Amino acid sequence: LTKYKIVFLKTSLITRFMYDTFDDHYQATIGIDFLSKTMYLDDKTIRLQLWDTERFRSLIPSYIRDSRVAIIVYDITKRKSFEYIDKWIEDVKNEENVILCIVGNKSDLDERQISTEEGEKKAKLLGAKIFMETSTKAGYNVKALFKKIAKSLPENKPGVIDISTAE
């Protein structure tokens, strides 16, 4: 099947995507610098590839154009991780449409330094297609997040039977 490519931008979410479901698709082939895993969705087996996740990341701008998706994860406990989303959400467009994804981290960590409604409003303003909230400590929506990502990825006239009743 088609080989979807999804750049990520932490590293906890990639770890949680694996080590979660043992549903017969454990054998996730791993390439150089990117991790590929086949995902089950309504009898469909779609190969989702994560392109990348200090000392490096000067090349991931070249990865964005090849990547079908560009995930954004931000820490909800600090504003900087939330405010810096704009630079990268413009950069992805500067570098064909993509299925943009917005998500916070450490939601269940005192918490909620930024209101969830404010995050939703700003994501809608930036044009984000899907917004989900997850957590590193056994996230209850990371599976839902990846399911929504898989769903969002891509995948005549009637024939007139003019024959009349046998007369």
Binding site: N156, P158, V160, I161, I163, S164
Partner: protein
């Protein structure tokens, strides 16, 4: 299940033969691979016990063994013309026969010993006539007979058992099937290989040149993979001479109209299906049917049609009858907006509906027969006032109605399957 189709036979009281089929059905372009496993039911511990009648645990020697695959086309002369072919009415015709291939020579089996022989037949003809048995006027039957000799008693005893084998027609990458010729003398393949099994910088230069798609590059480098028919069958879902395109007039949705009056719209989940796939249909009838008519009942069915070639038809009148394999009835007295129906034909490793194929003398087709019952749409087609009184107006069912029996057939391709059932 067992992961393979295994048939077990008892040669003698102390020996068992297991015939293992690597696949349920073998396509026209592939070999026939079958494993014969001979095992001794005795135990080595009892081999030295000391009237005892320990003969059950004695080693047994088989001198000669053989396996042969044959195919026969059976038909009745009442409908098929015998006079132009080159027990009261059934007549047989040999299609193919693999010459008798020796399984082993002078094999000795000790107690508790298993010996496996893998027989691999030569490449079957691309236009092999597929196995066909869900019929009464014509049929094609392939049988594999395996036999050998045992010296259990003073007189050399001989064992020989025949097991049915299923053959499917070759399907190209783009759904092209060969018109299997039937009026031929015979086919004589080779004996077929048998193996007893054993118990237990050119590439660099090529890569350098290539460097000066990723998958394509890898393939090229490994050159210094869709060829199997099963792979083509599986990949068929991911698209859009004697060869004929089986998928030619695909259409997701069909519209049923009688005398230019619409009755219902039939929508298929997929343009084509396989022999082991559930046919999902959505019939929208109330919004589509004309206001003057009400479809009160609708029976859907999956039927197999035999179009006998006019050349090979005896003369002595009517359209072929549809041999139904599944039916589902619906009562639509109320304003039935739509009906979702799931025609699932029988699926089993030892029983699957034969695919769609064409032969020299007859053609096999699969169709969806929908029979409607149409009545005049009155204000209340079902209830008639019976008793009227203050505080209540009783109604009761109409005793008799009137309608017609319009019936139609929607063609639908159903090709052979790649997925193999693990076997009982």
């Amino acid at each position: 299940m067992r992961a393979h189709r295994i048939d077990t036979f008892l040669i003698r009281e102390n020996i068992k033969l297991e015939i293992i089929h690597e696949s349920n059905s073998y396509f026209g372009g592939e070999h026939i691979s079958i494993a014969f496993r001979f095992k001794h039911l005795g135990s080595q511990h009892e081999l030295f016990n000391y009237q005892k009648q320990m003969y059950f645990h004695q080693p047994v020697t088989l001198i000669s063994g053989y396996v042969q695959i044959s195919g026969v086309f059976q038909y009745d002369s009442e409908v098929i013309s015998e006079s132009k072919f080159k027990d009261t009415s059934i007549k047989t015709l040999p299609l193919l026969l693999i010459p008798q291939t020796l399984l082993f020579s002078e094999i000795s089996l000790e107690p508790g010993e298993v010996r496996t022989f893998y027989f691999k037949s030569t490449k079957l003809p691309k236009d092999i006539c597929p196995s066909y048995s869900s019929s009464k006027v014509a049929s094609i039957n392939y049988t594999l007979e395996v036999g050998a000799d045992v010296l259990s008693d003073d007189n050399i005893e001989k064992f020989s058992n025949r097991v049915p084998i299923t053959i499917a027609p070759y399907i190209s990458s783009n759904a092209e099937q060969y018109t299997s010729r039937l009026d031929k003398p015979a086919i004589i393949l080779k004996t077929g290989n048998i193996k007893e099994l054993k118990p237990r910088x050119x590439x660099x230069x090529x890569x350098x040149x290539x460097x000066x798609x990723x998958x394509x590059x890898x393939x090229x480098x490994x050159x210094x993979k869709s060829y199997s028919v099963r792979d083509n069958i599986s990949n068929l879902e991911q698209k859009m001479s004697n060869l004929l395109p089986q998928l030619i007039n695909l259409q997701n949705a069909y519209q049923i109209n009688r005398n230019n009056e619409t009755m219902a719209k039939v929508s298929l989940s997929a343009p084509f299906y396989k022999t082991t796939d559930d046919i999902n249909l959505v019939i929208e009838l109330d919004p589509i049917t004309t206001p003057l008519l009400k479809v009160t009942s609708l029976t859907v069915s999956l039927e197999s049609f035999e179009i006998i070639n006019p050349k090979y038809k005896t003369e002595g009148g009517s359209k072929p009858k549809g041999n139904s394999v599944y039916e589902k009835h619906f009562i639509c007295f109320d304003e039935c907006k739509s009906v979702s129906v799931k025609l699932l034909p029988p699926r089993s490793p030892t029983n699957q509906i034969t695919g769609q194929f064409k032969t020299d003398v007859f053609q096999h087709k699969w169709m969806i027969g929908l029979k409607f019952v149409i009545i005049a749409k009155t204000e209340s087609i079902t209830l008639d006032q019976f008793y009227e009184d203050k505080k209540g107006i009783l109604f009761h069912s109409k005793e008799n109605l009137e309608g017609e029996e319009f019936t139609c057939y929607v063609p639908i391709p159903i090709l052979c399957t790649s997925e193999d059932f693990m076997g009982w």
